[PDB]
């Protein structure tokens, strides 16, 4: 059977000093004892009768997508394309799914990386593995959401019971955003917020849907007057922005609205 001579693996049969060489199957897993290298089990990508095969660190022939000197090769199961043998690198092109993992094989019969447009959809294949990205992912300075199928998403997406927004380019949109004439506010992680936040224009109110008014969830509402929200007090002027410092209203009331947060810290009732 299979014996280890000096960190390298070999195969011998009953006669004595009968080194075997060539393809052998030791149970489930198949090996190749290189007749060039004294019958030593081949590790990594190796050429046998002009065909390419891949063996793990233990010398057993493997199937699937693997990094090569050429790029990502597909060492296909038997009869996958033009009656190929088990683990033979095939001249494959197109989409390829192997147990959830999705790959796209470019015209050179090798796995593609980064942005690839497939049909009318955008996909992002890992530069590390060649596998399509799924879910929320940072790609460069921006964040994108991809399907369970690796299709890049545009519009509002519910991720972990929070709303995110991906523009016409799939980018995640953070801060005070204009979405087709309506304004919304996203946290720096992308999560759409309700409350008053610091916008380029100043402090603005992004309100919950009200049955009257007819505002969308988290849509900027052109508020004016005092706002009592989340145990906080704000006053908005005709700018539909919250005021800071001292403010006295004809109703008697004298307020001090925190310079940093625009929230009421002091309220003296007068006449």
């Amino acid at each position, epitope marked *: 059977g299979l014996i280890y001579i000096n960190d390298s693996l070999y195969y011998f049969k009953p006669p004595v000093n009968n080194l075997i060489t060539g393809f052998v199957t030791v149970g489930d897993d198949k090996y190749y004892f290189n007749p060039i290298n004294g019958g030593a089990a081949s590790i*990594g990508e190796t050429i046998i009768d002009d065909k390419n095969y891949y063996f793990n660190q233990s010398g057993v022939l493997q199937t699937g997508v693997f*990094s090569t000197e050429d*790029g990502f090769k597909y060492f296909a199961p038997a009869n996958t394309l033009d009656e190929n043998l088990e683990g033979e690198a095939i001249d494959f092109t197109g989409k390829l799914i192997i147990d959830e993992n999705i790959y796209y094989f470019d015209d050179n019969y090798r796995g593609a990386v980064e942005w690839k447009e497939l049909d009318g959809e955008m996909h992002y294949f890992s*530069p*590390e593995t060649g596998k399509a990205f799924k879910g929320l992912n940072q790609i460069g300075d921006y964040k994108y959401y991809f399907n369970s199928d690796g299709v890049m998403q545009k519009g509002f997406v519910s991720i972990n019971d929070n709303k995110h927004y991906f523009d016409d380019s799939g980018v995640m949109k953070v801060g005070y955003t204009e979405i087709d004439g309506k304004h919304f506010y996203f946290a720096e992680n992308g999560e759409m917020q309700i409350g008053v936040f610091n916008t380029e224009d100043g402090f603005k109110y992004f309100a919950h849907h009200n049955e009257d008014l007819g505002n969308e969830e988290g849509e900027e509402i052109s508020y004016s007057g005092i706002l009592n929200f989340n145990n906080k007090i704000y006053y908005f002027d005709d700018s539909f922005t919250a005021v800071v410092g001292w403010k006295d209203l004809e109703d008697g009331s004298k307020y001090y609205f925190d310079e940093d947060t625009a929230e009421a810290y002091i309220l003296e009732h007068h006449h």
Partner: antibody
Amino acid sequence: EVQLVQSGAEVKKSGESLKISCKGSGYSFTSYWIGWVRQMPGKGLEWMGIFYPGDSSTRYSPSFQGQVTISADKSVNTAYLQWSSLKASDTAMYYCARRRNWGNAFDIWGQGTMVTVSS
Amino acid sequence: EIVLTQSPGTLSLSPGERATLSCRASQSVSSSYLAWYQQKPGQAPRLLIYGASSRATGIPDRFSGSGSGTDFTLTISRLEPEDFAVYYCQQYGSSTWTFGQGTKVEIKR
């Protein structure tokens, strides 16, 4: 950021032996092949060899086959180029460059290691 | 084997001008394996173009790559001061990587 940082400038006498390093940071070291390019003074670029950290597979230019050996991380997260008996003709700039996983272009380069070899 | 011959060797043009650099291969070659590198003096090479026409990360739009078969071209639509350097074209084939001898882009004055 993705970067390969190389060992300092080397001045060795002829026939001596040298091992030069290239530390990868900002990326998954085991996911990318890493290569060695020689730039003789005032001349262009010559490819020496490539190494795969996560397979340990190596392939050399027939012109560098035997004359040098490529290896990696010895735990974390460095590649190596070494000579057993240097020549004065080995005085050059040595670059290690990370390879893209389509279609073999070297996307990240090291600052370089100047290797000066004279008696 | 595969031999990359670049022309001119020196290209003297003034800032704002269009630069056209050539790379001719000794034999027909895959566009996937064609790359262009820029090397400023006393600095390391940097990737500009991969896969003959694709632009590497953070590479300005003035840099454009084209060609097929044996004739390849790097174009700089408008030369900026930083753009004056050496340009090497590269290819992979038959288990080995090959580089061009370079083209210097000098400032015409």
